[PDB]
């Protein structure tokens, strides 16, 4: 079809980069600036994958994924979290609340594309 993506980051450049890169790759992309706006969008549709920054406004990315995992329709949905941390020990919180995998910032298009590809 064209996998449906919800990307959440308060950074304008991050949203534009993700949106442009994924859309050029055949994805249907929807962006949000914070956890509140993201949750509201996720609640109203059915995204195939969610990409979310850990340092989101309104709530941490951890609380966001946790709230997302609380909705039955998103129990198995792959979630990819953006972080500046390369150290696994530093974000065990991610696996705990239900994150599927990570994407370390700063990344590039190929990193983004391959990483997404590998969690679907």
Author numbering: -1, 1 to 119
Q: What are the paper's exact sentences on this?
A:
Vibrio cholerae contains multiple copies of chemotaxis response regulator (VcCheY1–VcCheY4) whose functions are elusive yet. Autophosphorylated CheA then donates phosphate to the response regulator CheY. Phosphorylated CheY interacts with the flagellar motor protein FliM and influence the direction of flagellar rotation from counter clock wise (CCW) to clock wise (CW). As expected, both VcCheY3 and VcCheY4 possess (β/α)5 fold typical of the response regulators.
VcCheY4 was crystallized in two different states; one is in free state with no ligand attached (VcCheY4free) and another with a sulfate and a Ca2+ ion bound at the active site (VcCheY4sulf). In contrast to that, neither a metal ion nor a sulfate ion was observed at the active site of VcCheY4free although both of these components were added during crystallization. Absence of the divalent metal ion do not cause any change in the side chain conformation of D9 and D52 compared to VcCheY4sulf, but the carbonyl oxygen of N54 points away from the metal binding side. As a result, the β3α3 loop of VcCheY4free takes a different conformation and moves about 3 Å away from the active site. In VcCheY4free, helix α4 is shorter and β4α4 loop is unusually longer compared to those of VcCheY4sulf. The plot of B′-values indicated that the crystallographic B-factor of the β4α4 loop is much lower in VcCheY4sulf compared to that of VcCheY4free. Interestingly, when VcCheY4free is superposed on VcCheY4sulf significant differences are observed at the active site, together with helix α4, β4α4 loop and β3α3 loop. Our packing analysis suggests that, in either case, these regions are rather loosely packed and their conformations are not influenced by crystal packing. The crucial residue at β5 that acquires ‘in’ position upon activation is a Trp (W101) in case of VcCheY4 and in both the structures of VcCheY4 the side chain of W101 acquired ‘in’ position. In fact, this is the first structure of a naturally occurring CheY where Trp at this crucial position is observed to spontaneously occupy ‘in’ position, even without activation.
